[PDB]
Amino acid sequence: NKDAKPLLKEMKKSKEFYVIFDCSHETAAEILKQILFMGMMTEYYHYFFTTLDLFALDLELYRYSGVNMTGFRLLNIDNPHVSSIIEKWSMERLQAPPRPETGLLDGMMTTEAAL
């Protein structure tokens, strides 16, 4: 659980910009925080996560202004039933005691809970 700053330093020195991050939710959160901290926010990179939860985790579209992030999403939306269920999840989460924000948002479905 350390920083992979050298690996990306050679990766950028190798005239290569297109890297795939196979990782878990914890590791995904920590790597995203590290890459944002270092300054990897330009339009000369393209990143992808194999983790299926990227809508119930702390992702903000306004931090992204130069970098392109694309991903997979197991869940299906635009279903009124799935909607009503997601408001039920949010309303049952909000009154509950707050949970730490360590790279995980509450009020939205996660994969294991849904399955």
Nearer Cβ to a second copy, position 36 or 105?
Answer: 36
At its nearest, how many Å lie between a second copy and the CB of residue 68?
11
Nearer Cβ to a second copy, position 6 or 100?
Answer: 6
- Using CB under 8 A as the binding rule, the residues of this chain from 40 to 69 that contact a second copy are 40-42, 62-67
- Partners of residue 46 on adjacent β-strands: 18, 68
β-strand pairing of 46-49 with 18-21? parallel
4 lies in the site for a second copy, by CB under 8 A? no
Chain CA centroid to CA 12, Å: 22
CA dihedral 89, 113, 62, 1 (to 10 degrees): 140
Nearer Cβ to a second copy, position 18 or 62?
Answer: 62
- The 8-class DSSP code of residue 43 comes to T
Q: For binding to a second copy (CB under 8 A), which residues are involved?
A: 5, 36-42, 62-67
